Amino acid sequence: PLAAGAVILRRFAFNAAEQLIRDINDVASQSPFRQMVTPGGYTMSVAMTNCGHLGWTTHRQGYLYSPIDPQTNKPWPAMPQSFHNLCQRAATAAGYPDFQPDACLINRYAPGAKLSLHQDKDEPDLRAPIVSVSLGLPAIFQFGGLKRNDPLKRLLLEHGDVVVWGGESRLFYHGIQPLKAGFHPLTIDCRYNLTFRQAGK
Ligand SMILES: O=C(O)c1ccc(O)c2ncccc12
Ligand SMILES: [Mn+2]
């Protein structure tokens, strides 16, 4: 059992990937990818956008979920059908049939992009899982435990892999190591990851 509460579904989204990527591009045509600035003043190497009713974003030197994209002053694009359906199939298979995300954060990793170790604790109910979908180039996902200094474990996440982070794992510190450059036939030179969240109360 790699991470208590987590359910790894390798290649679960492999068949859906081309459609998912088309929908990423459609979302980004409305709410573009942008590299947000952390509360500490650093520009993230990962570029982000969102779809759904709520979107994860910097605002006033903190993080929060907002119904409005600060870059466009318009709502985030609606949740694509492909996104909704894939998430529900994965969550249901993993034992979370009532998971109803209202936010999907879309991350784009260019070579060298990384995410420092952190917890996702900005959501109102931490009993709801987060569903992660990997597309394109492979990345090393690192995760520890409930404490910042718990022992780290690592696993490669490859194109089409889905992880449902539930139970205890929902609160683990985690991150992504600097992305290795390469080629993928559907994303060309990057990785994307979708993370579905229940962000509304
Ligand atoms: O699955 C991933 O690649 C991933 C990457 C970066 C994150 O901040 C995440 N947060 C929660 C769940 C998954 C992820
Ligand atoms: Mn995270």
UniProtKB/Swiss-Prot annotation:
GO terms for cellular component: cytoplasm; cytosol. Keywords: Dioxygenase, DNA damage, DNA repair, Iron, Metal-binding, Oxidoreductase. Changing residue 122 to A: Abolishes activity towards single-stranded DNA containing 1-methyladenine. Alters substrate specificity, so that the enzyme gains activity towards single-stranded DNA containing 1-methylguanine. It is an enzyme of class 1 (oxidoreductase). Pfam families: 2OG-FeII_Oxy_2. 2-oxoglutarate binds at residues 107-109, 191-197. Its EC number is 1.14.11.33. Binds 1 Fe(2+) ion per subunit. It comes from the Bacteria. Changing residue 148 to A: No effect on enzyme activity. Decreases affinity for damaged DNA. InterPro entries: Alkb, AlkB-like, AlkB-like_sf, Oxoglu/Fe-dep_dioxygenase_dom. This is Alpha-ketoglutarate-dependent dioxygenase AlkB. The gene is alkB.
